[PDB]
Each structure stands twice: as C-alpha cells, then as structure tokens.
Design an enzyme around this catalytic site. Sequence first.
Site, short mmCIF file in Angstrom:
data_model
loop_
_atom_site.label_atom_id
_atom_site.label_comp_id
_atom_site.label_asym_id
_atom_site.label_seq_id
_atom_site.Cartn_x
_atom_site.Cartn_y
_atom_site.Cartn_z
N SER A 198 0.84 -1.18 0.00
CA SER A 198 0.00 0.00 0.00
C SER A 198 0.89 1.26 0.00
O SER A 198 1.74 1.36 -0.89
CB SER A 198 -1.01 -0.05 1.14
N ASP A 255 -8.85 -4.48 -6.96
CA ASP A 255 -8.50 -3.69 -5.77
C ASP A 255 -9.27 -2.34 -5.78
O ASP A 255 -8.98 -1.46 -6.59
CB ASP A 255 -6.99 -3.49 -5.71
N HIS A 260 -7.41 -5.23 -2.09
CA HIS A 260 -6.26 -4.67 -1.45
C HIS A 260 -5.57 -5.60 -0.42
O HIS A 260 -4.40 -5.37 -0.12
CB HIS A 260 -6.63 -3.35 -0.80
#
Length: 703
Positions: A573, A648, A680
């Site tokens: 991330s 995602d 994600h």
Amino acid sequence: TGDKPVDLKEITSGMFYARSAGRGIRSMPDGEHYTEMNRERTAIVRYNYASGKAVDTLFSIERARECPFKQIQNYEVSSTGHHILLFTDMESIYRHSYRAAVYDYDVRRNLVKPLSEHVGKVMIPTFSPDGRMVAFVRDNNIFIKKFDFDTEVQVTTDGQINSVLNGATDWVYEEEFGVTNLMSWSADNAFLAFVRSDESAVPEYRMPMYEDKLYPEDYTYKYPKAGEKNSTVSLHLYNVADRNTKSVSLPIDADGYIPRIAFTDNADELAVMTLNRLQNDFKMYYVHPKSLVPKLILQDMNKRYVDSDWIQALKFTAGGGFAYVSEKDGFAHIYLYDNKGVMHRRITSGNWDVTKLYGVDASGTVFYQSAEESPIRRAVYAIDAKGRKTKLSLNVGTNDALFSGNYAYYINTYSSAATPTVVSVFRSKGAKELRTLEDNVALRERLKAYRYNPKEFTIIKTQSALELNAWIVKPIDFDPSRHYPVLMVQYSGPNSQQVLDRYSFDWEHYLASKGYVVACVDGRGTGARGEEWRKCTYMQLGVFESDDQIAAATAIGQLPYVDAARIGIWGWSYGGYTTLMSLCRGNGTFKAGIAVAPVADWRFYDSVYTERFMRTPKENASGYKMSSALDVASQLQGNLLIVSGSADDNVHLQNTMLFTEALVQANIPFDMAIYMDKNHSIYGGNTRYHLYTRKAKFLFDNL
C-alpha cells in the site's frame, strides 16, 4: 532457543497468530456487566465485570423458539434487554461495511423472528434509546421497525444504489472517515436524524471480475480520485410521531464533509461534525431538532489539517459537554468542554501524543491511551478532576482497553514485541487486575518450540541527523564476521507506525532463517512523535519518507555484519509506493524492492485521504509532481517485484499497470504478479501463501 525451523506456510496459516478479544465484547448500560458470544457463537452470555461469572445466557440456539440458524456472527442488545438483534449470513462490502440477515430475538417470549417481515439483507440496524424501535438500512433506504405496534415504517424513498444513500455512507466516507452509520436517534426517541449522501455525480470505477463467468462482470462503484467530485451531503430529521422529515441548513460549504452526526444525551442537541474540503477547519454544531437552528459549539483550525480520526473519536459527557483531542499545540492532547462550547479544563500536556480517548466517568475522571512512555508503546491512563494522572497499565508494551459503562472496570488487551495478547479484566480504582480471560498459553509454548531471534529495538542514526525508531531481527546462526543481506520492511504512511512494542510474528522470521537480516524503520511522517514529525510531509508525500528509508539503508549498510550491496525494501500500500520511490530516488541504494498494491501517483488515489495531506491537484501541481513515483519510474534501479490484486477497490490496478508501462518504455526489467479477483488484502484460499512464497523466492533470487 527452540528446535523447529520456522516454516512459511505456518506463518501464513496463522499458527503464530494470537487469540484476542475479537469475538464481540460489549458493555451493558447498567455499567457492571458486559455481553459476549460464546466460543461456538451459539449463544450470547452476560458476564459480571467484578466477578467474571456468567450471570445468565441471554440468548441461545438451543433454547430459542423458531430459530432457523445454528450460529450467529454478531448481535446487539437493546437498552432494556427485551430485544436482541442477531446477525447471520454476513456479506462484507468494503473494509467496515456489511449487510446481513438480521433477526429480532424477543427475550420475553423466547422467540426468534425476522427483524423485518420483508426477506432481505440489511445494514446498520440501530436501536432507539428505549429499545422499542430499530432504524435500519435496506436498498439504500431507511426503515424503522417498531416492536410495540408490530409495524415497519419507511423513512426514505429515494435511495438508489451507486447514486443516493440514506444513513449508510459512500466508499470514501467509510474508508477514510471511518464512518458506516450516519443515523442517530434523539434521547427521547422522538427523532431519527440522518445524513443523505448523493453520490450521483461522483465518477465510477469499474473492476472486471473473472471467477466462474463466461463473460467478465464489472464491480461498479463510485470512487472520487484526488480533486474530483465527492458526494453532496444533506442532514435530515425524521419525526417519528409526525412521520415527516425536515432538512437542516448548515452554514457550511457546498463541498464540505459531514463525517459524523450524533445526538447527545439532551434530547434537544443534535451534534453535527463538519469539515471543509481542505480539511483544516473542523466545526461542530448543535442543532435543535425542532427549530432546526444550528449553533456553532466547537471549532478546530489547523495550519495543515485536522485529523478526522479525532472528529470520529470526540466523546460526549453525561451532562452534554465533551472531551476532544486537538493537535493545536503541536501534540495530540485532551481538552474538556461544556455544552456551550466553553473549554474549561485542558487535560493532558507535554511532548507526547494521546493516541485514543476512551471517555469521562461520572466523577469527571478522563480515561485515555497515549504514547507518553515511548512512541513505540501504548499505555492506558486516568487523569482525575484534581489533575492527578495514574498509569493504569501494569505491563509495558501495548495496552488497549474497553471500559464498562460506568468506567469502574475495563477489559484490557496487553501485548509486547515478545509477548502475545494478555486479555485481562481490571477495576479502575487502584488499577487492580482482577483476572485474565486469555493469555495465550499455547502460542507461548509454540513460540518456545521454534528457533527465532527476538526483535531488537533501537535507533537508526542518519547522516541527516535524525534518529529513527527501528527494529532488527538478526539471522539464525548470526555470525558478526559475516556480511548479510538486509530486507527493510516498512509502511511509512501519515501517522502510521510499523516499529511498535506490540506482538507480531510474520515472515521476518522465515527470512531470518534463510540468512537475511530484517530491519524496520519508521521515518518522518510516522505517528506518536508529535504533529510536526507527522505533518512535515504536508503537500509533498513520499519525499521525506523515501529520503529516510534511503538514509536508514545507508546507515544500516555501514554496519560491519551487513552487505551494503544487498539491501532490499518491502512494503504494501503506502509502503509499496515508498518502495517505488526509494528505488527511484535512492540512486541504486536498494538492490531489490517489493511493492505490493502501491500507489503510483496521488492523482489516482481517493479524495479524502489524498487531499488531507496534499490539497487538490489544481492547488498543488508541484507537490503532486514531486510526490509521483510514476513520474520518476525511468529512474528505477534494482530488481523490482510489483504485485496487485486484479479487483482492488482501494489502490486501483491502474497504479501498477501504469508504473509497469513506464518501466517497459524505459527498458527496465522487472517482475510482476497480478492476483485474480483479489482486493487490497490479496487473500483467498492459497493466495497469501502463494504470494509470500513468491516474495521470498524473489528475494532469494535477487537480494
């Protein structure tokens, strides 16, 4: 000192995961009891805080009449215990939101019924203060179930998927403001207030989904990227008796936010939390629900931004003032206000951050969590009305508590780098540990069985003269006279931390067993070191965070047991982004990097998050340019593994697709993996094991 080699599939299977409080503890309004589902999720049991006895089973599958299911997944008890909501067939939507089959257990009649006589999953069912009514969301409309009349009234009619939401929230409000429920009942049960979010003009994102389909089908939802249109929000009061709705005019901007509403304990005070688009001006109004007149009660302005987590966590006091954490003076501290907005007592002070606000008891004692001991640690404190501060935590590491209704007791969860969760019950007066509900004996014994080295905490001193909290796990037969590779592990996002005296047993120990040093360094931008440390990145994300990982690598590299030519970096991330940045801006400092679901450019990320830290693209073209990893992709050096899920909804596949193309056109070789239909968190079935195996192997071949 144990015998067994750490195995990657065991990490990945959760064999080292601590048992927590997870399953369902809730304090009852009487203040002396909490409820909890049993282990089998077959019953809800009521417990005494002081004694820990199971006083009674409030509901069970075995005993209840007409119960169509064998387990529950969540419950809620009404203020009087006459009704218990039971949740089954949960479906996750996004991080926090879900829908479910919800039943009404009529306690007095020992009867399970449907909440609604309409078959269909619902969201966000919320009891009225008197327990007699339940407001809930279905198909983006608000409904109120009324148990006294055995009737359902429909509050809104204009709800429509991907367009109009009543009570429930859009993707970005859920993810970035942390709010799934923008409904609130008056204390006297006369009004249901709600926010209506109009998402119609917000752009969509489409994600092709592939599993078990002849033709792919798009998951379609509204997602405002940086600078784009957000939902427009409006505030409404529904009067239950009149079955009529009124709008509230708030004196705020047309592109502002309402991230929370809540009636206080006065029937006449609807608190409305508002925030401007720049997110540097937080204003709370109290609206009278009959006159609809809003009154400004609290204003918090910041040079850079107000952190909305403190808006969500603002705590009202019995007697309608409130406790609020503001970063005004350079650190996060508690301020106490009356119901007229008069700030009468500042509660905490010093060069450290409050990290959580629990509340204020009937004696005006304020209960909170902070990093006063160290940025790395968390302890629970009490400050009484004479200003006396007591640390309530008995063990040093990370402590977090769930207080009883009266704050006379709390269920504490404690862990340290070395020690997995101890969940134990305390009496607040004298900070007295009463008993332990869980202390992970088994996991402790498993740990003793395995060969692993402890996380060694320290500081990395950079050439720039920062001192960065850090941990290091040395390799298994660590020989000081050898030159090991290092994997640097990091996240680096605003106010985040990965260097925490808190339990965690992840793939660091697998890699350590294969000859790698693993290090973790928290750079500028990270939390619990005060406001300046976390906000110095404002309008230029990633620059300092990159600089610091590069600088930390450079220093680690000068340790004699470290091979400077074999330093890698990993992150997921914001950590993924930070990897890309570091490979792009470190002039070959890192030999390899792994970037999992990375943001490639802040243009691609969402409204509320991105703008908090960067303002809009129009207002900050330089910043967005400086902060773009995509822009500097042709400067990448070292071996890259870049990974994303195909579906995602948080960091769009777009980021990875685009960055790879930059690499291709600059003739930069790299590895990539795209996991089908994954989001994600990239999981499902064998997915994590496959991913971490891929990652380990990539390091074995390239680091």
